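Exercise: predict the structure of this protein bound to Q0U.
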Amino acid sequence: TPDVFISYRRNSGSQLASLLKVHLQLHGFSVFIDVEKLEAGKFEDKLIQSVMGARNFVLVLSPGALDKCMQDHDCKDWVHKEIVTALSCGKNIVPIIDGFEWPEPQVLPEDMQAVLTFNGIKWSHEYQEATIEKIIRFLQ
Amino acid sequence: TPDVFISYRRNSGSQLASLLKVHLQLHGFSVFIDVEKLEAGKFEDKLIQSVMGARNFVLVLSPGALDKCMQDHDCKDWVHKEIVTALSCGKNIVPIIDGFEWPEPQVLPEDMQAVLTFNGIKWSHEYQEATIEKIIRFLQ
Ligand SMILES: CN(Cc1cc[n+]([C@@H]2O[C@H](COP(=O)(O)OP(=O)(O)OC[C@H]3O[C@@H](n4cnc5c(N)ncnc54)[C@H](O)[C@@H]3O)[C@@H](O)[C@H]2O)cc1)C(=O)NCC(F)(F)F
Ligand SMILES: CN(Cc1cc[n+]([C@@H]2O[C@H](COP(=O)(O)OP(=O)(O)OC[C@H]3O[C@@H](n4cnc5c(N)ncnc54)[C@H](O)[C@@H]3O)[C@@H](O)[C@H]2O)cc1)C(=O)NCC(F)(F)F
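Solution:
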């Protein structure tokens, strides 16, 4: 059972998500990121259960990271699905701000607008060690 | 004197560059990346000195990473200057390919066209530990 689930957008946050994985593992956290721990079987249910199983939900807000969520009322976008799962399970949600533009809440589906109300950590290229230390402080 | 200099484009390669720095330090290499080791003074001289001092030159070829080098015949662009320094000192150049598209040599200044002749390592999001192990194989 991993302590941390990392949710990210492949086309914009793959590298930061991987970097967060390495640091958090070095600090003793078990981390789920799909390319390392999503294994055999039907992945829709495996992903959902992995979010449920992890106490902490680290959300990589790269630029445009929530764009595919907009108008996704059928909840088929995977970042959307992961966030809704994290919200519904009362997870400790820790957004990571990396060039993200804060959208007006009303452009997002109602079931995930609450993600914007969580306190986010700004990724600092110049102060990465301090960013990591702060992320660790936010984890449970 | 760091063993490895990491050259990269801030606007497309910062995360991979830091990811590479973390991994290489975990495997025992001293690494120069500007946000961690570029300290006080005139940075023109310090950057060039740091390239000259490092046996290995790890070049992060994110998408469009050499765009600003094109037509930079006065050699004002910083990745251009770092590459020319690495080529001039005969450093072990190790390009890391991350969605980079191979240009025709002639679009680049003649003093850095040689960089394309170096065997580059494909960055694999799904096989990152294998990518890293290949990179450590390339370093001296
Ligand atoms: C299952 N899967 C898709 C997926 C996994 C996790 N997510 C979560 O959702 C966020 C990313 O969301 P994002 O929107 O950025 O990704 P998509 O562009 O939607 O994915 C579409 C791309 O996956 C490939 N694709 C489609 N179908 C399969 C398939 N049956 N098998 C293998 N690849 C498949 C296509 O070739 C597209 O190129 C993260 O937080 C993740 O946790 C979203 C999607 C994989 O990748 N498995 C490989 C690994 F296990 F290593 F991850
Ligand atoms: C000195 N410097 C600029 C620089 C350093 C290294 N490189 C190498 O060259 C590649 C990157 O090339 P790239 O084209 O991506 O860089 P630019 O985006 O053009 O930089 C322009 C931006 O730097 C900032 N900028 C300008 N002037 C100064 C100044 N006097 N002081 C602090 N910031 C300055 C503005 O905010 C611009 O917005 C890498 O391989 C690096 O090794 C290029 C440029 C810093 O950063 N110092 C901070 C730290 F030490 F933490 F790095």
